[PDB]
Amino acid sequence: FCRFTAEGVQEIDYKDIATLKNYITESGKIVPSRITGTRAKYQRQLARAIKRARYLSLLPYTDRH
Amino acid sequence: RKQVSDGVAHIHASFNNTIVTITDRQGNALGWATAGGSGFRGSRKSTPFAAQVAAERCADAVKEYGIKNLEVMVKGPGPGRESTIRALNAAGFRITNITDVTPIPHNGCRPPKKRRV
């Protein structure tokens, strides 16, 4: 839980799909913080990165399209 | 009266009625039957039993196409969502897989107003 504080990484990258995929369900929906354990400061940056990656077609919005 | 060699089942469901439609992967309808065309109307129209009847009715109505392998896409939160799945698995329908295709708007349009009762 709160992985972005153990590593201490200041910024989350929208291009790091290997990390972003661990926070996205098969449906393509962001996982809440009450489930993953991420901090709020980092959950907000996660949501921003996920949306920015979904704009660049690096991630699905829904599981269908 | 003609083959397509495959099929795709599309279970449209509504609280009022359930519709079953066998179609080719290209989306061209081969056969269809509704739980309201099974002789069930009004309240009788909306029940897992009526959808179970409509599933087999559509199965037989398409049976002359020799469909065997089918993909099931189910839609709508009404009852008979799985009842229809089971009742079409009948007649040796080789189910590849299922998928929920229910339309989920991303806060797009205004729904009607809440009913009072």
Binding site: - | D100, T102, I104
Partner: protein, 52 residues
């Protein structure tokens, strides 16, 4: 592969993805004041539950 416990695998993704609840929720228009009132109700309940 069996068809029975292949259909229970459907009733797990279907439910845990919620969509059944979402169709009911988006069925009728909830006024924003009712949204916030219900959010506050759930908040106070599932909060003051885990004290007493």
């Amino acid at each position: 592969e069996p068809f029975d416990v292949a259909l229970r695998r459907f009733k797990r993704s279907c439910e845990k993805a919620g969509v059944l609840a979402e169709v009911r929720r988006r069925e009728f228009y909830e006024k924003p004041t009712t949204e916030r009132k219900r959010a506050k109700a759930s908040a106070v309940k599932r909060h003051a539950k885990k004290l007493a």
